[PDB]
């Protein structure tokens, strides 16, 4: 079931979080955060900039000093704190889900059943890793005792997007804190509220001051300040491929800080002729339209084998036309508004480009409401690889259906992209499944399913969809600095 | 028990290696490689540039295609090939050691007993890793079967320095080949010969054409071409910190290729009052003077506790004065010439700066021979943290001895650096050793020893000394692209 | 902060626990459990036998059937349940500690601050392991996809001792439940209460019926029934070496069930001449006297270097004389009574033997109270290796102090034993610590400390002190059955 | 590509191997080893007994002493030695293959192409493990430094069968030697020759005396002396379930030595109606008839779905009737003789048993030649679960074909056995494969293939088919003794 929401939840936090205290921007400047469903301003938020970032970094660095409460804390206790933070989030689940929906636009039912649940599972998962990421005792040559210490990388700058505000924060905080690092987080200007409230919970949980610092603000200012900072040891970024470049260049230009990127995609969803029609159709719909189509791993290239193409398209169009668009607080709503005006216009622009280039508009294609940033579930058929809607990430409710003949053909076409975040394969055949999962150049390959995330399984991109991995044990690698200690001994023995 | 060397080894390879064939630069241009012991030209070498690197990348990419011999090869067989390569190198050990000394300048005895031995151990170590770097089967939530495939990152651009020509090539090829990647290597212009001959052995061993391609040439040309190439998936660089920045910026500006860096250092060698005097003195000498002082992790900051400072310095000066400098082919020679004129002049410049800033010159300080790039073993006493020779990497036979009082003091001074490649601690006290090894911010902390390397133990730097690790199991991480495959199953059970 | 105890807590559970329900023994027989501090009966407890064990096994087997709630449960959820169990035990902490002290005899302060704290840390540690014990994807030769599934071993029979009732229960349940196994636990006849109450908490936590079944009773009856059962897949035993043999014999004679043993010991505590006198004395005292000396890893062989022997002995005797013996509920009591009469007499018998064989009685040596099973802290000096009190496990407040001269001597004397559960070394010298830690043949070697347990570090014995390890990642191995799945694929690629 | 064999290979080794030297049995007794193809005696072999085993154990223990060549040797060097042994075995490949066939009876082509090839890959695989089985540095609570040492278990008694003489020796020596243990091996009385020759190669390779000792002789004498020896730390046995019990009982009755067992089986080969008929028929034949049916994991229960039963049986019978039985040295021979008379008679007995209980004899069922121990490829149809030929391991060329209807039915029937060594599933359906591979209670589950072994993939049984695993990383666990070292440090930091 799902508890009734407060459609107009009160905002308790809207400032910069440093040393477990709330601060106004040094410039005293604030920026408005809008409710995408109405287009009206929710409240003002402290606009952090370079100077505010500097304050946050110094606080983090201080909390990371040898002998500090955070450094001396037992690894198991860090796990205890993460579990406490999770318990607190669960206590304030209904409120957080409502505030998430208010600032993001996604359906309250989803924020409660999906986003929040995943946030809880992510933090609790990593909570258990806190005291289990062992170093090694190595059998080196000669009379020596060699071993490695898995230490925290240090002050970690984390910049996250707006599509999954709370979840993105969880994916970043979970591994970082589990391994004993300190954080200076830069949340999206479109969705700063939920993350800021969580900071209050981090304080309530008992995390030492300076361990987690959140600086709301713009990208070119606050974000770039973190990426170019001389005292930030590592930066984790999740967003567009274009900005990912800026981040890596900034890291190489400054202090050569370690970098991991989770960028965009143009994920291919391959439906073989032997697939379960009903299942594939529903999953292909979910694969694309999930979260208003604002998912980095969205199945934006639906490949369908010719023998079943016509039927698949017919069923897909019907499903899209039946997709309920409206008030995200209404239990019947399947699709809310896009995050903001910029995205709203961007998507309409892509739809226009799709029409211009010859793609067959099967349904939707325009605005779905007079107020808010609602867009009709759109489906394009007979899409070709060279079309703009087949190459660029739309990040909206715009489905692309392409036809193919052979398995060798679809492999080449699916892999012919600078992106490689994810891919899916729908088939009943064992050999086909194995052939494709191996051949596909993507960080995650789903078989007879889509958007199946687990805190236990790593997620990340190939090619220009990013570098490094998040979630699972792999998610701890980027947050660890390996130290080798080689000691001379009297006489080494096996 | 070292075999008599051939002081005038014949050069059989001096061109660009692509598809197991030797090619002249497209521009037909060549550059001279000098014997640092005489200053005379050994021979000309094909000067590779962008167009040459482009040919290399295409060959590598072709060898990496799905279904190719290298891709279909059993992981165990890749291990067999690496073992065969090692066997071939051992067969031609005496020749390679001589050719190494001829082009690099290091004593032949060291080339044979150290470099070649370490080359063999590295290749053989990784040969064993070829079929053991397992992926994982993950207990994800829901009715799904989730697992990861540890696939090769792809086309790897590897740029190596001149201080350890053969060894650096092995540290690179070992992990790359063991994990099934393809290589486009750019060797140092100062020492291209030995690596090129090894390429001939790579062909002889049976490695498929295009798996390993070597392009000799300059850095701003060939090296930059690789770092900025749109089809190179990963770049591994070892060299100066200055150039490391260029590499990472090039990667972010191009295709967001994965990057790992092994940069410079100013490693502190801490000698506590309770240390074994004789041992610490000898190890401190080796720590700094090894390989003409041309070691990335050289103990260029010798911290000595006041109570033993005087005696330590006296013994160190004596050892430095008795260090034999001369023909690297003479068995009595402990120190050969510096790699080239540029390094020769740079070192003298640092010695001049050391005198100008108030450091007490105890011995050496000038040229050691009329012909070649020989420098006298130089030792500076009463060095202060603020001095240039105390902050900048000299990369030559110039020792810095600093005095300290407390253990807390030395930690702070040792850690006050933008470098953090290595560090050492000499003491008989258990608690002191553990306190320091933990407190020191360096990739490798040696206790009662120095420059102890093992193919089993990872090596890499903290801060601006680099990112990522080489050697050991960790050395495989950067050469692996993790793919998650999540399959829907009828009913998941434990 | 130790809360005021209920020096006579009420017993709510005293029956057999099967399918989350309380049952009387099939025979309806019961056995008394005595308060060692008064010798008075606390209450009767259902005396389980073979027929009762058979019921428990069938219940366990049923809960382990493919498709059952326990088998289908998400691994992460098993973790949640273990964390819930912990929270429940923490809620009833004060009560459990008191009940522990009542049935066992250990000081309430220790039961609260040590036993329960460790029980909570153990369960919470393993809760985090529930969804992280991955299988592997293996790069096998040929066109195949090979991987391993880490499945539960199945029905696990767990037999535990009386020295740490609650903690031994946690050490067993934590790893077993985290890996998805089912349990048929046989608790000690001397201390069945606390475990039985925990079963109530297991039910309250939400664990499916049949997952954990507890059968109180005698060893030759219930215990042997489990060890010899044809449907028990694995048995984990902790107790004496003598019974350990019976366990392995029973396993081999029955169905070849997997076996792991945590037996007795005669752990050497080596005090080098350069050790911290005060610290070594206090730790050596703790090492032997902890938990009324009823610790499997007790430092029952205190080796002291001759140069410091006299002083160490003097200080040791003073500390032993000042050790407060009395009512466990009194805050000032450091030592409570022995678990039962049998142990009471066995200890006195050993003290008598110590006197008869020439060991020098320095203090104590007799009964400490008129009522209960209290024994005076006894210390024997000038003990020789061949003496009975130097070879056999006393399991009481009887300290053995031996004199030695050289480090080579002590290693040989320490290792000359059929036991090898633990050992300790006290010294300030780095080389000595490393030499001894490597040379000593024991599952755990403590340096400058003793009885330092962590749920993160494995514990187990060498030689006849047992086989297999508990705690840490290693504790999951014995509870895992490895399955290899090798699938034929169209064409294998790296 | 198989070199012409020496049909009458000379025997160079037929004594007891201790300390790299050949010794006669203390009793001077010898036993004949027979050529199963002719029934003639090949030669006599020293009959080792208890006293001979005692000598071997003492030699092994001596070679395992702290500071010995074997204990001090670099782990990487152990790998070098293993690779050398492999090279020597390959050098004498043709000879060993012929001698294997001479004493065992299996076809020379198979001995050369399969057995020897597998032996080479096993040792070479484990050679790579020697310096890679790392211990751990654990983030324990409090101010401590905790880590583990992966030490050798010690003196390992290894008892192997006669079905795969050389391969079984490799599966044993590889992991034991890679981890630095010492060995006392007891080879099968029916096939002692090849293992003894390999011992010569062991000495030639450079292994220190006492590291590997081989004692040929009978089971109740030599084998039992090893299992019950007071100085043998671990025993690995491969053979019948009956003797496996004796081994575990001996271990528990003696010194509680660690035990791993690889026993028999009655592995089910499930053929679904949608399987590739031709492929399944050929694979089901191989599954049962390989190595004269003398394979522990032989697919002795071929379950076939009713809709394809009739055709499958027809094709199976035809294939069985075409299977060439004859001189193992003739290239045309597919099946040689059974290992000895005892097995010969046992098989004939089971064949008669099958006829008596109602199983339909489709072909064969009798002796295939006048001389030797040749038996006709026998196929039984319409076999029922309750029949003896359906429950007990025949270990001969006798196929059982059973009919089933549903997938749920077959799972229950396949799992209804005290054996659980292996199983197979033939189907084109993804879901069926996953459903079955998860449901089957077997150590190895092959999908669309059978008898696919890889040094990288673990092998072992469930239930009464054994305990523990061999091959892969898992094969190292039983050969490792874990030691925890917990050191007190000034101040623990992350
Ligand atoms: O197949 P299989 O028929 O060879 O299996 P098997 O059990 O009959 O024999 C396998 C191995 O165990 C040895 N063995 C036999 N009886 C033994 C005993 N009582 N104690 C110790 N080892 C014994 C055998 O000699 C051989 O080495
Ligand atoms: Na917003
Ligand atoms: Na040169
Ligand atoms: Na009692
Ligand atoms: Na024979």
B306 and B391 in a single domain? The answer is yes
How far is the C-alpha of B296 from the C-alpha of D290, rounded, in Å? 58
Can you tell me whether residue B40 is helix, strand or coil?
Answer: coil
Q: Is B117 on the interface with A (CB under 8 A)?
A: no
Q: How many residues can be counted in chain D?
A: 494
Measured in angstroms, how far is the CA atom of residue A171 from the centroid of ligand 2? 20
Q: Which residue of C has its CA nearest to A78?
A: C125
Residues in the ligand 1 pocket, defined by CB under 6 Å:
D 159-162, 186, 188-189, 218-220, 223-224, 227, 239-240, 243, 246
Strands A258-262 and A234-238: parallel
C275 DSSP assignment:
S
Known catalytic residues of C? 262, 296
The minimum CA-CA distance between A174 and chain D, rounded to whole Å, is 16
Dihedral pair phi/psi, residue C219, rounded to 5°: -70, -55
Can you tell me whether residue C272 is helix, strand or coil?
Answer: coil
Cα dist from C420 to C269, C296, C347, D303, whole Å: 12, 11, 22, 50
B241 and B295 in a single domain? The answer is no
CB D279 within 8 A of CB D426: yes
D478 DSSP assignment:
G
How far is the C-alpha of C413 from the C-alpha of A327, rounded, in Å? 80
A411 and A487 in a single domain? The answer is no
CB B119 within 8 A of CB B165: no
Q: Which residue of D has its CA nearest to B472?
A: D132
State the residue for tokens 């050949």: D22
Per-position b or e across A233-266, b if 16+ CB within 10 A of its CB: bbbbbbbebebbbbbbbbbbebbbbbbbbbbbbb
D80/B124 Cβ within 8 A: yes
Tell me the residues of chain C between 403 and 442 that have a Cβ less than 8 Å away from chain D: 418, 433, 437-439, 442
A134 and A270 in a single domain? The answer is no
Known catalytic residues of B? 262, 296
Q: Is D481 on the interface with A (CB under 8 A)?
A: no
Can you tell me whether residue B71 is helix, strand or coil?
Answer: helix
Strands B155-159 and A466-467: unpaired
Instruction: Report the CATH number at residue C380.
Output: 3.40.309.10
C147 and C198 in a single domain? The answer is yes
Cα dist from B87 to A90, B83, B112, B206, D80, whole Å: 61, 6, 15, 13, 12
How far is the C-alpha of A121 from the C-alpha of C28, rounded, in Å? 46
Cα dist from D63 to A276, C251, C273, D159, whole Å: 64, 32, 32, 20
- Report the domain count for chain B: 2
Measured in angstroms, how far is the CA atom of residue D373 from the centroid of ligand 5? 11
Cα dist from B343 to B43, B250, B394, D75, whole Å: 20, 26, 9, 39
Q: Is C149 on the interface with D (CB under 8 A)?
A: yes
A208 and A280 in a single domain? The answer is no
Helix (H) or strand (E) holding A363: strand A360-363
Q: Is B277 on the interface with A (CB under 8 A)?
A: no
Q: Is A149 on the interface with D (CB under 8 A)?
A: yes
Q: How many CB atoms lie within 10 A of CB D71?
A: 19
Q: Show Cβ contacts of residue C409 under 8 Å, excluding neighbours closer than 6 positions.
A: none
Measured in angstroms, how far is the CA atom of residue D37 from the centroid of ligand 5? 9
State the residue for tokens 């004993």: A180
Q: What is the CA radius of gyration of chain B?
A: 23
C340 and C415 in a single domain? The answer is yes
State the residue for tokens 């059973």: D402
CB A147 within 8 A of CB D158: no
Instruction: Report the CATH number at residue B222.
Output: 3.40.605.10
Can you tell me whether residue D92 is helix, strand or coil?
Answer: coil
Cα dist from D232 to A191, C329, D182, D212, D256, whole Å: 67, 48, 10, 13, 10
Can you tell me whether residue A470 is helix, strand or coil?
Answer: strand
Mutation pick for ligand 1 pocket among D190, D219, D263 (CB with most ligand atoms within 8 Å): D219
Closest residue (by CA) to atom 11 of ligand 1? D161
C159 and C196 in a single domain? The answer is yes
C127/A132 Cβ within 8 A: no
How far is the C-alpha of C420 from the C-alpha of C459, rounded, in Å? 11
CB A295 within 8 A of CB A287: no
Percent composition of chain A: helix, strand, coil (DSSP 3-state, to 5)? 40, 20, 40
Cα dist from C18 to B484, C15, C82, C229, whole Å: 41, 10, 19, 17
State the residue for tokens 């995408």: A36
A240 is in an annotated binding site: yes
Q: Is A493 on the interface with C (CB under 8 A)?
A: yes
Residue from C72, C92, C129 nearest C9 by CA: C92
Can you tell me whether residue C171 is helix, strand or coil?
Answer: helix
Query: Domain range for residue B415?
Result: 265-454
B140 and B276 in a single domain? The answer is no
Reply yes or no on whether D262 is catalytic.
yes
Helices D241-253, C241-253: inter-axial angle, 10-degree rounding: 170
A223 and A269 in a single domain? The answer is no
Measured in angstroms, how far is the CA atom of residue D103 from the centroid of ligand 5? 4
How far is the C-alpha of A395 from the C-alpha of C491, rounded, in Å? 36
State the residue for tokens 């309770």: B274
B187 and B231 in a single domain? The answer is yes
A243 is in an annotated binding site: yes
In the numeric block, which tokens belong to residue A252? 């190489």
Q: How many contacts does C have with D, using Cβ atoms within 8 A? A: 188
Can you tell me whether residue C168 is helix, strand or coil?
Answer: helix
How far is the C-alpha of B469 from the C-alpha of B238, rounded, in Å? 11
Task: Tell me how the structure was determined.
Answer: X-ray
How far is the C-alpha of C299 from the C-alpha of C302, rounded, in Å? 6
Residue from A384, A436, A461 nearest A269 by CA: A436
Q: Is B139 on the interface with A (CB under 8 A)?
A: yes
B442 and B344 in a single domain? The answer is yes
B491/D456 Cβ within 8 A: no
The minimum CA-CA distance between B258 and chain C, rounded to whole Å, is 19
Q: Show Cβ contacts of residue A352 under 8 Å, excluding neighbours closer than 6 positions.
A: none
Q: Which residue of D has its CA nearest to C250?
A: D249
B243 is in an annotated binding site: yes
User: Which residues of chain A make contact with C439, given a CB cutoff of 8 A?
Assistant: 493
The minimum CA-CA distance between B10 and chain A, rounded to whole Å, is 34
User: Which residues of chain D make contact with A430, given a CB cutoff of 8 A?
Assistant: 427-430, 433, 447-448
Percent composition of chain C: helix, strand, coil (DSSP 3-state, to 5)? 40, 20, 40
CB A320 within 8 A of CB A283: no
State the residue for tokens 């559970």: C13
In the numeric block, which tokens belong to residue D191? 């096939």
């Amino acid at each position: 079931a799902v508890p009734a929401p407060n459609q107009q939840p009160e905002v308790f936090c809207n400032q910069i979080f440093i040393n477990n205290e709330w601060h106004d921007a040094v410039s005293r400047k604030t920026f408005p955060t809008v409710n995408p469903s109405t287009g009206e301003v929710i409240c003002q938020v402290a606009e952090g900039d370079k100077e505010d970032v500097d304050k946050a970094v110094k606080a983090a660095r201080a909390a990371f000093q040898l002998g500090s409460p955070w450094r001396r804390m037992d690894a198991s206790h860090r796990g205890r704190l993460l579990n406490r933070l999770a318990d607190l989030i669960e206590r304030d689940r209904t409120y957080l889900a409502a505030l998430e929906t208010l600032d993001n636009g996604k359906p309250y039912v989803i924020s409660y059943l999906v986003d929040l649940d995943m946030v809880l599972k992510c933090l609790r998962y990593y909570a258990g890793w806190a005291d289990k990421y062992h170093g090694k005792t190595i059998p080196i040559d000669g009379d020596f005792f060699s071993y490695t210490r898995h230490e925290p990388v240090g002050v970690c700058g984390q910049i996250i997007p707006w599509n999954f505000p709370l979840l993105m924060q969880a994916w970043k905080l979970g591994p970082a804190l589990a391994t004993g690092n300190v954080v200076v987080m830069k949340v999206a200007e479109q969705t700063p509220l939920t993350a800021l409230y969580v900071a209050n919970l981090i304080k309530e949980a008992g995390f030492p001051p300076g361990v987690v610092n959140i600086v709301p603000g713009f990208g070119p200012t606050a974000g770039a300040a973190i990426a170019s900072h001389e005292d930030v040891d590592k930066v984790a970024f999740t967003g567009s491929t274009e900005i990912g470049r800026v981040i890596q260049v900034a890291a190489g230009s400054s202090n050569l800080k370690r970098v991991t990127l989770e960028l965009g995609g143009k994920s291919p969803n391959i439906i073989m002729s032997d697939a379960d029609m009903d299942w594939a159709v529903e999953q292909a719909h979910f694969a694309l339209f999930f979260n208003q189509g604002q998912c980095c791993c969205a199945g934006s290239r639906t490949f369908v084998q010719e023998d079943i193409y016509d039927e698949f398209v017919e069923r897909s169009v019907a499903r899209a036309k039946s997709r309920v668009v409206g008030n995200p607080f209404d239990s019947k709503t399947e699709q809310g508004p896009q995050v903001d005006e910029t995205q709203f216009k961007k998507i309409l622009g892509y739809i226009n480009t799709g029409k211009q280039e010859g793609a067959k508009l099967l349904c939707g294609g325009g605005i779905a409401a007079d107020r808010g940033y609602f867009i009709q579930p759109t489906v394009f058929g007979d899409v070709q690889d060279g079309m703009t809607i087949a190459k660029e990430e739309i990040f909206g409710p715009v489905m692309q259906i392409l036809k193919f003949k052979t398995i060798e053909e679809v492999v080449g076409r699916a892999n012919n992209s600078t992106y490689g975040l994810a891919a899916a394969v729908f088939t009943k055949d064992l050999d086909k499944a194995n052939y494709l999962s191996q051949a596909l150049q993507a960080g995650t390959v789903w078989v007879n399913c889509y958007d199946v995330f687990g805190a236990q399984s790593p997620f990340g991109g190939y090619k220009m969809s990013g570098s490094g991995r998040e979630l699972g044990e792999y998610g701890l690698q980027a947050y660890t600095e390996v130290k080798t200690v080689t000691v001379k001994v009297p006489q080494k023995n096996s």
